Design a protein around this ligand. Structure first.
Ligand SMILES: [Mg+2]
Ligand SMILES: [Mg+2]
Ligand SMILES: [Mg+2]
Ligand SMILES: [Mg+2]
Ligand SMILES: [Mg+2]
Ligand SMILES: [Mg+2]
Lengths: 338, 338
DNA sequence: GAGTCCA
DNA sequence: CCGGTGGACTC
DNA sequence: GAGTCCA
DNA sequence: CCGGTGGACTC
């Protein structure tokens, strides 16, 4: 569970355990002795807890201590089974804390979408835990999907095919001069739910925790929307970076620029909203780096130039994350006609 | 020396040793037990050798083994003196190997610069080791300075003050609207040598190795050119990356786009040549990523249309890096009147 | 299992 | 995916 | 010296 | 500054 439990750990089958001993099943060309079983770790620590939709104490706690609990639980497990032999490289803790920050934040946002969508189709406002009721007029057309995108992905594949064709034709032209314009991905996109899906229940159901089936339901969701999203209906992009270093700030900044050039410049979309979430900004003048104007915006020199990155948000608690997303939906969905 | 010598090591003062034991002198909030003494390492391994300008065997061995030699000499020193107590994090070896790849490459380019410059002023073509004599006609006005840029730096400080003035008025306008356009730095700039320095011998002396004094001379050179370079006199920008990961690609790509926007779009300079060098590209997607067109040029009625990054280069040997730079000088200096 | 690829 | 670094920078 | 920033 | 990583995909 969230608080480590000796008994609950004893109850695990060897394949569900957080530390996997691989001393006698080594990986070709790695010295790894113990693997941190990320998916096991989410199931044990967040099996019946989504932060922000759990107890008041978990919802209000320093979000860093929350995102850090899985690794801390896994090290206690490893120390119990293997004592002085237990060791893990800091680059395993780094990899796993990254994925954990992303998957858990994305799950908080998923439950916000479900509460939001439930209101929009006429079912009122679930009241535990307590959050401000949105004041925007409910409409099934204002529902949204939270898509944790896979490690490797190309966000263009979310678009209806006619929009993919406008992008393809643009690149065709660049190819004749030996140039390209590749697109990669944010960590997460929120999109307006396509009309064909506005009576499906799955988008309105809050999950109770990161059980292996809920992990898969959440991580596979993008496959359902691929091919179905209009350029204007990509409502928020999010990169997640557990901590910052000044040389790791650039991927979101570049991708945001490319998203703006293509969605706004080539497909008529309104302002693309892209933001970055971290738990440890400090040591960097990251807030200053992310004030940069869109390069596209500058190159066209239209009446209003916006930032490529709308904000660097540092969530202090899971409740805060949730409250911020609700306030964002409440404002951004005005723009979608009821 | 370049080949490890127990005897050379035995002769070193405690303060010159490649490994510095800090078990009794810990860094507050660090668990570090032994320090990799980067500057002592370069002095030991490269104190009498700049690769590409040394013996035929060093010039032509796999450059990855050339750049990995200091860390390998350090680990041999550590293992010898401390045996099984010798421990250092992979993150220590990552940091220092990145700085080795940068400093040694820069040094190879410094000697190239010096040999070019000797020819430019009419002193003929040094013959050992033998490189193809350049064909462009000599002129003191076609000498160049090789500038290994400091860790924290803003390339705009290289520019003559009237140019800095143009960038700053443009940014002042952007601030009214709550936007900025920050500049950082590539790792290295080659600039045209300013008129005032064009009969100074320091810019034509090849160094014999990376002794501490020569380390300082190379790392300090950018200071002598601050405030002196015309916008079209920044001839090449280099980003060094020892290995690649797909998330680490974006800092040079973004910066190259900012240099192009500001130098070509606001200051009238020709195409900004910016390239990346790695020893380990781990696949082919990196080459695809760097075929991206420069964003500013994609807006109708701006500067020319071309790649942000000209090329991802994987130097097989020191001699090859030397050769590529001489051939690049032979062509790009056509643009300068002699 | 072994190899490759991802970030 | 990101954290532990050697050296520079600040008082 | 003690502490922070740099990438 | 960058290397060691857990999981995904394929046979
Ligand atoms: Mg990602
Ligand atoms: Mg993702
Ligand atoms: Mg991320
Ligand atoms: Mg640098
Ligand atoms: Mg540099
Ligand atoms: Mg570099």
């Amino acid at each position: 569970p969230f608080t480590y439990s000796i008994e609950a750990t004893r109850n695990l089958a060897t394949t569900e355990r957080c530390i996997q001993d691989i001393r006698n099943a080594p990986v070709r060309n790695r010295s790894t002795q113990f693997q941190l079983a990320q998916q096991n770790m989410l199931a044990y620590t967040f099996g019946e807890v989504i932060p922000g939709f759990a107890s008041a104490g978990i919802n209000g706690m320093d979000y860093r201590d929350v995102i850090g609990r899985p690794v801390e639980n896994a090290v206690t497990e490893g120390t119990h089974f293997f004592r002085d032999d237990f060791r893990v490289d800091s680059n395993a803790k780094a990899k796993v804390a990254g994925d954990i920050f992303e998957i858990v934040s994305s799950a908080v946002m998923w439950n916000c979408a479900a509460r939001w969508n439930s209101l929009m189709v006429g079912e009122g406002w679930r009241s535990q835990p307590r959050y401000s009721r949105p004041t925007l007029s409910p409409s099934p057309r204002r529902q949204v999907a939270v898509l944790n995108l896979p490690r490797s992905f190309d966000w263009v594949s979310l678009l209806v095919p006619e929009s993919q064709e406008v992008i393809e034709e643009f690149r065709a032209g660049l190819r004749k001069d030996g140039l390209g314009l590749p697109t990669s991905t944010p960590d997460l996109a929120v999109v307006v739910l396509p009309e064909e899906f506005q009576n499906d229940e799955m988008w309105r159901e809050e999950i109770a925790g990161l059980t292996r089936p809920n992990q898969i339901l959440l991580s596979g969701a993008y496959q359902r929307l691929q091919g179905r999203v209009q350029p204007g209906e990509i409502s928020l992009a999010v990169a997640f970076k557990r901590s910052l270093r000044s040389d790791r700030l650039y991927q979101p900044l570049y991708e945001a620029n490319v998203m703006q050039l293509l969605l706004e410049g080539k497909l008529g979309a309104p302002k693309v909203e892209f933001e970055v979430h971290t738990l440890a900004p400090e040591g960097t003048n990251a807030f200053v780096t992310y004030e940069a104007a869109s390069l596209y915006g500058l190159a066209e020199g239209r009446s209003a130039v916006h930032r490529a990155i709308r904000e660097l948000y540092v969530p202090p608690t899971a409740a805060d994350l949730a409250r911020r997303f609700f306030a964002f939906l409440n404002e951004r969905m005005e723009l979608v006609n009821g």
